[PDB]
């Protein structure tokens, strides 16, 4: 495992629907302006990013970067189609290479399956293939000082693991020192028996955190018990990335946004949303 | 409005994944054993139901019945395909006919669209088509002394309306005396700004309630603020059906369960779950 620090990040889609040269500048300037330690770049297509341009922007605004992604049908590492697993491995290697080039140390999100709504439950083979793929990815990432954090998401976004408890059982089959649990308050709000159980169970295996309101809008205007969740992080003295994550129809990534079913306009002002979110988080943690 | 009374029901999928002679009896016996006033039949294919058999079962167990359903792609009344909208009209008419033959008074659930994930946001055409289909259904239902209740569901299950406030605007566009809002605590837990606002706004327009835990499991083992929700119902003196709704991989309807992404086992003992649920509800609204 590679060093983790308590640091606060903003998800790219708070600012930019695309990672164009302009999109990258807007989002990096945005996160820096709001007082975030890092930007979390969504690498659903890790070939599209101009890596040298982004590195220059990170230097220019004195900002760090981590990376999240979700696979697609074409790159689903759970697939019993070996060719599809191989495309997944390839995308995950490229995502790792981009992260390393940007000086990042965390590759997180739905990296262990296709992000979206499976029409049926995962077979034993689906899970086994995901475990093996996360073993190959962890081993690849280990050579480049990178930790992987598997994001537990709700039933509409994966059929592999929907609770931190399920994630930990999975991580125990993976059995890699640089593979961690990634929890997200939005997803926890749906799946978890309260906001503390999985955090307490994870302890040092909790490698990465997403802060999202129940509707993914303004923090504290929804149903997420943040009092409970932040008390739990304290009880294990969590010291790792915490990125604010929010999706509004105002800022749209043609794939990610429709996959995430973001039908509603829950905000318009990126800077106001991100500014208030960071104040909300730091008032309750750190 | 056709008569509504404060009464408690169990959703069929608490007991049975099919509506065969054996499945119908298992669900109706289960509801009766737990002391529910009614069973809610999941009528996703209303041509499947043996109506005489079910009517006999309802007599045998001294139980009333309401029906919920979700449309599918082939019967989507939001569709810009007039043949698909027509198929929707036909299925909802058949559903109404079944409910009428069972002496039921409530057709509820996702009757206004295809239950599931849409590839993009609903157009004003999609919504207009839905409102007009719900007008036609309400008028057909009214001839048979049946109320319809529009169930607001989360972003992964509809693009038409995800909050009670959105539900009420759709409802008033329908503009029919026997059309009502249907709220579900599980969906509210995701989309709503607290558990009171939509209920207080709805008042007499709220015609049907589903009680589901955040994870659709045992009541009071999740994240739903039931205290706030039940306080709000009291404020508006809600006197309508209240269905306990829960899904576990323990009991599978091979269509509905997969559509609802029930990957996890949240319970194994139907009678324990249903019994404890009713006690939980009557303790807070009895
Ligand atoms: O919560 C999420 C999706 O619902 C994750 O943050 C995303 O899958 C991913 O991180 C986006 O890049
Ligand atoms: O909660 C629901 C689905 O998530 C609705 O009640 C269902 O679509 C339907 O009513 C089940 O029959
Ligand atoms: Mn997340
Ligand atoms: Mn429901």
Author numbering:
A (entry chain A), B (entry chain B): 2 to 287
The authors write:
Here, we report the isolation of a novel protein from Methylomonas sp. expected to be a putative enzyme based on sequence similarity to ketose 3‐epimerase. The synthesized gene encoding the deduced ketose 3‐epimerase was expressed as a recombinant enzyme in Escherichia coli, and it exhibited the highest enzymatic activity toward l‐ribulose, followed by d‐ribulose and d‐allulose. The X‐ray structure analysis of l‐ribulose 3‐epimerase from Methylomonas sp.
d‐Allulose has potential as a low‐calorie sweetener which can suppress fat accumulation.
